Amino acid sequence: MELHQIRGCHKNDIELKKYNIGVAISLGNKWFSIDNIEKLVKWSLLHTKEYVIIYIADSIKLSDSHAEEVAIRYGRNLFIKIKERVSLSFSQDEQAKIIYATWSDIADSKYKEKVKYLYNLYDKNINFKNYIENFVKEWVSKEKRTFNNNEINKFGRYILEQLPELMVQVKARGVLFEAYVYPYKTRITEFVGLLQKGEIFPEIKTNILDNHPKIFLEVRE
């Protein structure tokens, strides 16, 4: 595993250890085996400024929040497996650098205001709604299963919940992390790139972005 492509800084800022690094796990994505998560976490500990923040970032009713629901159904059991692998793979010195951020650790009141902005935009702006939905339709068109329009719309809202964490630097239990690692560029990361630059839906940048954009580090074998 090494850095492939970087959006938001130069290669020199990474080998200089300027930033804390988040490991965004897409639970249910076949690449995020425990072995690959361990390799992302290993790489992150070696390149980080200080901390590695592990969190659930995607999931393509016991809670009003899909990301919360995911957290309590599956995110906890995943965190339990990662913890045990880590305590056998790393020294007590390294384990102290790891923060297991739950959805509620990240989605504080400031975060929820951003999400709420997006939800309202999804409901009142039909171009924005239509665009978010097509991300969903693209994904589902590479899966076998079909989905109705009502579920497409629901899946779109799930994206908006995670959007601020990809766009802005947020704190996880009082620890700012400026960059996150992910094994592949996606349509989401290209979308976020445009949002941060105000080249698409510029109202979003005006209302939720703070001139400290999340840095995306593409890291894989």
Residue numbers in the entry: 1 to 60, 70 to 230
Task: Give the original sentences from the paper that presented this experimental model.
Cyclodipeptide synthases (CDPSs) use aminoacylated tRNA (aa-tRNA) substrates to form peptide bonds between two amino acids yielding a cyclic dipeptide product (CDP). ParaCDPS from Parabacteroides sp. 20_3 (GenBank: EFK64745.1) produces cyclo(His-Phe)8 whilst ParcuCDPS from Parcubacteria bacterium RAAC4_OD1_1 (GenBank: ETB63777.1) can synthesise both cyclo(His-Glu) and cyclo(His-Pro)9.
Previous research by us and others has shown that mutations in active site residues seriously reduce product formation in CDPS enzymes. 13 and 14). Therefore, the disruption of activity is caused exclusively by the change in these few residues which appear important for the enzyme to produce a CDP.
